[PDB]
């Protein structure tokens, strides 16, 4: 695998140990051979279940989710998959790496593809290795990979909102049950007739996912409501997933707004993933797999893979060359490589709108590319009357930076920026000035 211009897809099955007995072993090798090597982990939930794995191995933990004192001496970096497609964007030096690792390298956030597309890009000129980890690399269209212990597959309607009979399956299990919901919004719903019903429930989501996530473990549950994120290796000591199979796909509309299209199908690679949260333990056979829709190749045309563009167009490679996609993900987006190359303080503008301003990288990309400065929220105020955001059936109203009690109608309008309270919310403390 070490070999310069390999690239390794290690696609054991789910659970088949591929973080905890497979990557120790590179790494050993990988320092053995010195071999500056990066570890991509997809959140710090995972990179602190790494440290576990790696205790004892001179690895430089470049996350505060992980409290450790470094000897200096690390030749290996651990980090997260954003945080590599971050360093890479601003003016900080990353190391060339020699060999570099992925862990659940079929995360489809826009800064993991980036960072695949980089990676593969330089394994492809000669200069590094690479391994991709996942059971479910770009286009498999296997939704029921092989599992430790054998897995009880049912084809179920599943509900997507409060229900008062006709689910009595769902509420009479005795277990502990995973559910794949498409939105946070719709997990809220379900969550609550659940708990109405008795039952203990967790929900997890991108923001919450950290902090929720030891819930987990600290607390006795019986549900666990969760958006996709749990496909990227969040374990849980359950013996049933239930799965709407159903998800949100950002599309982008004439070049000119994002929309939260659905829901609709989940890829077969996420199904397999949400699947593969049970069937884990080869001592409990029989965990459940309840699953209420098809899969479909709903990334097609879906935003991350363009916002994956957009990122790549940014980062420099070698004078004016620009990383490629991942080939096996490449076609997912129809867009010029090089189009979204911005020149150095429009591109600090996009960085900072990302990375202070929280914005999704399409946002932060419109802003930038119209010459609007980071902290100039004109723009929040300024958009057509059918860009106005609503609140509980209101306009959506902030106090701007001047003092001025104004609706909330973006020049460029994003669904993401309020696809939940939680969102708005964070979004009206943007267009106030409040970062
Ligand atoms: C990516 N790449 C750039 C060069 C070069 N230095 O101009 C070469 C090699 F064939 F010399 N590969």
């Excluded at 003016?91 to 020699?98: A, D």
């Excluded at 212990?149 to 229900?163: K, L, N, Q």
């Excluded at 949100?248 to 509309?253: A, E, F």
Aim: aromatic fraction near 8%; charged fraction near 25%; glycine fraction near 6%.
């Amino acid at each position: 695998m070490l070999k310069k211009k390999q690239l390794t897809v290690l696609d054991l099955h789910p659970g088949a140990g591929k973080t905890r007995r497979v990557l120790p072993e590179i790494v050993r090798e990988a320092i053995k051979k010195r071999l500056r090597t990066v570890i991509l982990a997809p959140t710090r939930v995972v990179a602190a279940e790494m440290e576990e794995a790696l205790r004892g191995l001179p690895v430089r933990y470049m996350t505060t989710a992980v409290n450790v004192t470094h000897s200096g001496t690390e030749i290996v970096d651990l980090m997260c998959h954003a945080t590599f497609t971050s360093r890479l964007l601003q003016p900080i030096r990353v190391p060339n790496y020699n060999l570099n690792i992925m862990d659940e390298a079929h995360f489809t956030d826009p800064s993991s593809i980036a960072a695949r597309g980089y990676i593969s890009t330089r394994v492809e000129m000669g200069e590094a290795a690479a391994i991709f980890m996942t059971a479910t690399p770009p286009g498999t269209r296997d939704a029921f990979p092989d599992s430790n212990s054998p897995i009880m597959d049912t084809e179920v309607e599943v509900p997507e909102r409060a229900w008062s009979s006709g689910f009595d399956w769902v509420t009479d299990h005795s277990g502990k049950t995973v559910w794949f919901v498409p939105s946070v919004r719709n997990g809220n719903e379900i969550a609550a007739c659940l708990t109405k019903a008795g039952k203990r429930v967790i929900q997890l989501s991108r923001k919450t996912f950290e902090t929720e996530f030891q819930k987990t473990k600290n607390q006795e549950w019986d549900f666990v409501i969760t958006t996709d994120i749990s496909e990227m290796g969040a374990n849980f000591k359950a013996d049933r997933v239930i799965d709407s199979r159903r998800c949100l796909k950002p599309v982008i509309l004439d070049g000119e707004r994002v929309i939260l299209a659905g829901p609709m199908p989940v890829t077969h690679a996420s199904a397999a993933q949400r699947r593969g949260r049970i069937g884990r333990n080869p001592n409990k056979p029989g965990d459940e797999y309840m699953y209420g829709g098809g899969c479909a190749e709903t990334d097609e045309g879906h935003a991350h893979w363009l916002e994956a563009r957009m990122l790549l167009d940014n980062i420099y490679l070698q004078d004016g060359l620009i990383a490629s996609l991942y080939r096996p993900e490449a076609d997912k987006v129809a867009a010029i490589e090089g189009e979204f190359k911005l020149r150095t303080e429009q591109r600090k503008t996009f960085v900072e709108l990302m990375k202070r301003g929280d914005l999704p990288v399409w946002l932060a990309y419109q802003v930038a590319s119209a010459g609007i400065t980071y902290t100039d929220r004109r723009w929040c105020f300024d958009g057509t009357t059918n860009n106005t955001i609503m609140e509980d059936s209101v306009p959506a109203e902030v106090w701007t930076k001047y003092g001025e009690k104004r609706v909330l109608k973006p020049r460029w309008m994003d669904a993401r920026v309020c696809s939940d309270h939680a969102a708005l919310k964070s979004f009206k403390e943007f267009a106030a000035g409040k970062r």
